Amino acid sequence: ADTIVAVELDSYPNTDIGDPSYPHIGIDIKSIRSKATARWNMQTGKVGTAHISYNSVAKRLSAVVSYSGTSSTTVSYDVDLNNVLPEWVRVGLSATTGLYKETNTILSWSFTSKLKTNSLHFSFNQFSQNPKDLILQGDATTDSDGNLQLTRVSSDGSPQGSSVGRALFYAPVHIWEKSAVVASFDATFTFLIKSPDRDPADGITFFIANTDTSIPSGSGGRLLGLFPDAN
Amino acid sequence: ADTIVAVELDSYPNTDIGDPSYPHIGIDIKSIRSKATARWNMQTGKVGTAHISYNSVAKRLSAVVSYSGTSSTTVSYDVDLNNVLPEWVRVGLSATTGLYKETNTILSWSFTSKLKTNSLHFSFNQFSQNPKDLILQGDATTDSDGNLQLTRVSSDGSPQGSSVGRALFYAPVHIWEKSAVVASFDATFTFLIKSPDRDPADGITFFIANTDTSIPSGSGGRLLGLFPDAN
Amino acid sequence: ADTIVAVELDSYPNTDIGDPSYPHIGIDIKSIRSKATARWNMQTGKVGTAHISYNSVAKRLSAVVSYSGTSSTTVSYDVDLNNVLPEWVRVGLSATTGLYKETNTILSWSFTSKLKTNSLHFSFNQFSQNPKDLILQGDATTDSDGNLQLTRVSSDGSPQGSSVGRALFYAPVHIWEKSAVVASFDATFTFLIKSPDRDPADGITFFIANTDTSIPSGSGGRLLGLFPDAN
Amino acid sequence: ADTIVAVELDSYPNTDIGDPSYPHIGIDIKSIRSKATARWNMQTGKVGTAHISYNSVAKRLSAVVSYSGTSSTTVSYDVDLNNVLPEWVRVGLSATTGLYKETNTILSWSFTSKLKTNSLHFSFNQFSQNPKDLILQGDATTDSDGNLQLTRVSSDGSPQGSSVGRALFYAPVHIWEKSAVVASFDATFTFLIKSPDRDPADGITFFIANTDTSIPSGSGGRLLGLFPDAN
Ligand SMILES: OC[C@H]1O[C@H](Oc2c[nH]c3ccc(Br)c(Cl)c23)[C@@H](O)[C@@H](O)[C@@H]1O
Ligand SMILES: OC[C@H]1O[C@H](Oc2c[nH]c3ccc(Br)c(Cl)c23)[C@@H](O)[C@@H](O)[C@@H]1O
Ligand SMILES: OC[C@H]1O[C@H](Oc2c[nH]c3ccc(Br)c(Cl)c23)[C@@H](O)[C@@H](O)[C@@H]1O
Ligand SMILES: OC[C@H]1O[C@H](Oc2c[nH]c3ccc(Br)c(Cl)c23)[C@@H](O)[C@@H](O)[C@@H]1O
Ligand SMILES: [Ca+2]
Ligand SMILES: [Ca+2]
Ligand SMILES: [Ca+2]
Ligand SMILES: [Ca+2]
Ligand SMILES: [Mn+2]
Ligand SMILES: [Mn+2]
Ligand SMILES: [Mn+2]
Ligand SMILES: [Mn+2]
Structure with missing residues (x-):
């Protein structure tokens, strides 16, 4: 199957x-069962921001998720990613709904990778109706406001259950190379999660995988479109 | 056929x-017959640097080609590129030999595009043996020193005639969009041209084209791998 | 006196x-009497965006000023700036009021300069209460919302007349050097101009000058805090 | 006295x-007595490269120092720098000689800081004869090849003992702010250390300090121009 860091x-x-009994942000290394989590004061209807970073010297993958003026949650995990990931990857965003639902609307997404002794940076502050630099998988679409709807939304804006969708950047990324002194990446995305459900679901990920990654069979709902099982 | 700016x-x-009677740098808009040229004091065996830039406000495509301490040649052309190019493009490098030959060795290549109211930047200071973020066409290869050999070179380093090769960046680039305030791009590459021929040939281009661009039939030699004829 | 490009x-x-009989954007080379202007559909109470760019190969200074969904105005002028400006400069923003007034509120400001064969980039999306990386001149202040008020605003938000204020970046910028292949700069700022006056005044500039530049005597009002007279 | 991170x-x-009994790279938090060191296979006469990075989420300051094809040494230290450093800083390079000597030649220096919810980046690949964007302290000079000589070198290139010199970037840097979601910085410099001494001395630092930092009295030699004593 795919090799996944998310x-x-x-x-x-x-x-x-394996989830804690509350909304959480988590660092996933080849399993939906997070190696590290932090409690997430998830806010329905407000725009959130996630920042993710890693470098091969500190070897500490970190993420912070925030709502302006409201909350901020941080999670880190010490991991040598050059030991997990193949040399060439694609990076992406995934989202699911299940029995319960939510919009998983991406308003912006940026990413930088550096291979020091290669550089790649992309930034999207609007998504075009036919994004030729993105691989859209499952239900992912871009809509009329220029946003990226990772999971299915009806004509009026209502999120639908049993949805899975992902968006990968078109170009493979060279995230390690044996002659590199240091490899680093940074990622930011902003997101709007709306829900009429008392318990919204299921969530959004930023993820790095083998370049030929695709939505595994049976990955809906709690598996976030990333893994074929909960091992 | 393809739509080409080079x-x-x-x-x-x-x-x-249509060439002037001397080595030259030129700006090509949909024809090998340059809309503007400048005399190029071409130096065999020394590393050169080319810088190219454009923005949709000034509407002036410019290029400068230099050898450190030796020479610098500049050419500009006023053109609304959003009137020539499709909205989605790929960017690349091309090179040919013909009766006469030369190495067309790319040592580095970078590119930035901005769609203001999208950003894409890549930088290569070394090329890996199997560059998964590049579309290699024709004879283009990367070699053991980490360089990009656009045209055929023998085992010992000797350039071969009748060669054509191109390298495009993998991801389409969004170089204009009707809601953009301004679109801009910048490109730099460094190059080493070696030749035992008294009159080396044929040259190197940086070029922007339709995303599905390929080497036209009959584009070898003086057509620089870009055009099917000299119209 | 100072040497000014604005x-x-x-x-x-x-x-x-020398003004045209309407609101306008203009390119100023050592005189308030613009070398080039374009009609500006100036909108009171809406946030505007200005983009400015130049490179020493194309030698064309350009600017575009826009309100989202409303209007966009462009002006360009062909000028070799390395022939006007000293090698070391400071860059800044200026604004005035006079008999008539307006808020000249800067919401964001960024700038990049490149000296190719040096790089400097700064970006402000919020301004702190005591910006130690800015030289504030005249009436310029930063306020509680994190904005830069170039001209005097009363406690309730009312703009005052007979105000002059400027903000320069602290570090001199190396905008040309005789060994450079190409020198380039880019600047963006966003601005909010509010006014209860039927004819608001006087305006905002982005400007490059000698590093020791200061507000000239008698530069208020129509002289935009840049020039001591209208020569 | 000054507050120092180096x-x-x-x-x-x-x-x-407190030094280990060998050349080393070290992370210094307010004391010359490093909180963390790693053995440095120091190479006389070859160009080295140092990369330093930190972000306020992972809270791990890291550094890697390398010679191409020869060696690479890494050191990290977990520290909340927003707890050590003031909100406004200057960043710089320092070097000393003492009884024993070496050239402390800076060939290039770059730095990025980001204040997320401010950006500053500078890059020097050549240093001009009178760098107006640098505060040169002690013996630091720039020479005819465009390099930064932090410590005294004679007319022919011979390093002198009992030298101290520093170069700070002119503009204060805003490295933390209470409303920031995350603060980050990255720094790279390349350096050439030549010596006719069997045991070269004393070393080079990259350092962050209070904006009004200056060379302390008695900081020569083993104190690297940073500290007034070895507490
Ligand atoms: O969308 C949230 C969840 O909905 C389903 O799980 C349930 C949440 N509440 C339930 C109540 C009954 C059943 Br049966 C299920 Cl399967 C669930 C499954 O789709 C899960 O994968 C998903 O995490
Ligand atoms: O490589 C340089 C040139 O070689 C060929 O043209 C010639 C240059 N000198 C010649 C002499 C004879 C003939 Br026949 C040709 Cl076709 C040439 C052709 O391959 C040209 O496309 C190319 O520009
Ligand atoms: O603020 C707009 C202008 O106000 C003054 O000029 C006038 C605009 N309408 C007027 C009416 C009368 C007089 Br007297 C003046 Cl000086 C003006 C002067 O302060 C000008 O510098 C400025 O351009
Ligand atoms: O430059 C290297 C060192 O030279 C001096 O220390 C000595 C190194 N070998 C010695 C031998 C004798 C004496 Br006395 C000294 Cl003070 C030293 C002092 O300047 C030290 O600060 C410095 O670390
Ligand atoms: Ca879950
Ligand atoms: Ca030709
Ligand atoms: Ca006026
Ligand atoms: Ca020591
Ligand atoms: Mn979970
Ligand atoms: Mn030609
Ligand atoms: Mn005017
Ligand atoms: Mn030590």
Whole structure:
């Protein structure tokens, strides 16, 4: 199967596959069962911001998720990613709904990777109706306001359940190379999660995988479109 | 056929299809017959640097080609590129040999595009043996020193004639959009041209084209791998 | 006196010192009497954006000023700036009021300069209460919302007349050097101009000058805090 | 006195004030007695490269120092720098000689800081004869090849003992702010250390301090121009 590293913004607690009993942000290394989590004061209807960073010297993957004036949650995990990930990757965003639902609207997304002794940076502050520099998978679409709807939304804006969708950047990324002195990446995205459900679900991830990654069978709902099971 | 905008570093004068009678840099808008040229004091065996820039407000495509301490040549052309190019493009480098030959060795290549009211930047200071973020066309390869050999070079380093090769960046680039306030791009590459021929040929280009661009039939030699004829 | 290059957003027509009879954007080379202007559909109470760019190869200073969904005005002028400006400069923003007034509120400001063969970039999306990386001149202050008020505003937000204020970046900028292949700069700022006056005044500039530049005597009002007279 | 955070490239072992018994790179938090060190295979006469990074989420200051094809040494230290440093800082490079000597030649220096919810980046690949964007302290000069000589070098290139010199960037840097979601910085410099001494000394640092920082009295030699004593 795919090799996966992800930062999950998990709005629904699936305690039966390892979630804490509350909304949380998590660092996922090849398993939906996060190696590290932090409690997420998830706000429906307000725009959030996530920042993710890593470098091969400090070897500490970190993420912070914030709502302006409201809250900020941070999670870190010490991991040598050059030991987990292949040399060439694609980076992306994923989102699911399940029994319960939410909009998983991406308003912006940027990413930088550096291979020091290669550089790649992209920034999207609007998404075009046919984004030729993105690989849209599952239900992911871009809409009339220029936003990226990772999961299905009806004509009036209502989120639908049992949705899975992902967007990967078109170009493979060279995230490590044996002659590199240091490899680093940074990622930021802003997101709007709306829901009429008392318990919204399921969440959004930023993720790095093998370049030929695709939505695994059975990855809906709590598996965030990333893993075929909860191992 | 393809839609082409290019800056050509033309080491061989083909006076019969419009070249001036000397090595020159040129700005090409949909024809190998440059809309503007400047005399190029082409230096065999020394590393050169080319800088190209454009923005949709000034509407002036410019290029400068230099050898440290030796020479610098500049050419500009006033053109609304949003009137020439499709909204989505790929960017690349091309090179040819013909009867006469030269190495067309790319040591580095960078590019930035901005869509203001989208950003894309890539930088290569070394090229890996299998560059998954590049579309290599024709004879283009990367070699053991980490350089990009656009045209065929033998085992010992000798350039071969009748070669054509191109390298495009993998991801389409969004170079204009009707809601943009301003669109801009910048490109830099460094290059080493070696030749045992008294009159080296044929040259190197940086070029922007339709995303599905490929080497046209009959584009070798003086056509720089860009055009199917000299119209 | 100072040596000045500026892009002026001139909200008040002073026809007696060379203004066209309407709000305009202008390119100023050592004189308030613009070398080039374009009609500016100036909008009171809406946030505007200005983009300015130049490179020493194309030698074309350009500016675009826009309100989202409303209007965009562009002005360009062909000028070799390395022939006007000293090698070391400071860059800044200026604004005035006079008999008539307006707020000259800077919401953001960024700038990049490149000296190719040096790089400097700064970006402000919020201004702190005591910006130690800015030289504030005249009436310029930063306020509680994190904005830069170039001209005097009363406690409730009312703009005052007979105000002059400027903000320069602290560090001198190396905008040309005789060994450079190409020198380039880019600048963006966003601005909010509010006024209860039927004819608001006087305007905002982005400007480059000798590093020891200061507000000239008698530069208020129509002189935009840049020039001691209307020569 | 000054508040100091530094990464030291310490070519001389002063075991009597806490150095390990070998050349080392070290992370210094308000004391020359490094909180963390790693053995440095210091190479005389070859160009080295140092990369330093930190972000306020991972809270891990890291540094890697390398010679191409030869060696690489890494040191990290977990520290909340927003708890050590004032909100406004200057960043710089320092170097000393003492009884023993070496050239402390800076060939390039770059730095980025980001204040997320401010950006500052500078890059020097050549240093001009009178760098107006640098505060040169002590013996620091720039020479005819465009390099930064932090410590005294004679007319022919011979390093002198009992030298101290520093170069700070002119503009204060805003490295933390109470409303920031995350603060980050990155720094790179390349350096050439030549010596006719069997045991070269004393070393080079990249350092962050109070904006009004100056060379303390008695900071020569093993104190690297940063501290007034070895507490
Ligand atoms: O969308 C949230 C969740 O909905 C389903 O799980 C349930 C949440 N509440 C329930 C109540 C009953 C059943 Br049966 C299920 Cl399967 C659930 C599944 O789709 C999960 O994958 C998902 O995490
Ligand atoms: O490589 C340089 C040139 O070589 C060929 O043209 C000639 C240059 N000198 C010649 C002499 C004879 C003939 Br026949 C040709 Cl076709 C040439 C052709 O391959 C040209 O496309 C190319 O520009
Ligand atoms: O603020 C707009 C203008 O106000 C003054 O000029 C006038 C605009 N309408 C007037 C009417 C009368 C007189 Br007297 C003046 Cl001086 C003006 C002067 O302060 C000008 O410098 C400025 O351009
Ligand atoms: O330059 C290297 C060192 O030279 C001096 O220390 C000595 C190194 N070998 C010695 C031998 C004798 C004496 Br006395 C001294 Cl003070 C030293 C002092 O200047 C030290 O600060 C410095 O670390
Ligand atoms: Ca879950
Ligand atoms: Ca030719
Ligand atoms: Ca006026
Ligand atoms: Ca020491
Ligand atoms: Mn979870
Ligand atoms: Mn030609
Ligand atoms: Mn005017
Ligand atoms: Mn030490």
